[PDB]
């Protein structure tokens, strides 16, 4: 699994 | 801001 | 702003 | 499975 | 699974 | 902002 | 800023 | 797994 | 910040 | 696995 964010 | 994934 | 994912 | 998302 | 998000 | 994940 | 991620 | 986050 | 991962 | 973030 990929997890990925910005903020 | 938020961000939240699970696999 | 709120990004949930869930797989 | 794939989510994505923005704000 | 994948998961993206961003704010 | 807050990134978390899980795998 | 938070980052906190899980394998 | 990856986990990546940016704030 | 803060940064905290685990594999 | 990994896990990587910037604040």
């Given at each position: 699994?990929?997890?990925?964010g910005?903020?």
């Amino acid at each position: 699994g990929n997890n990925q964010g910005s903020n």
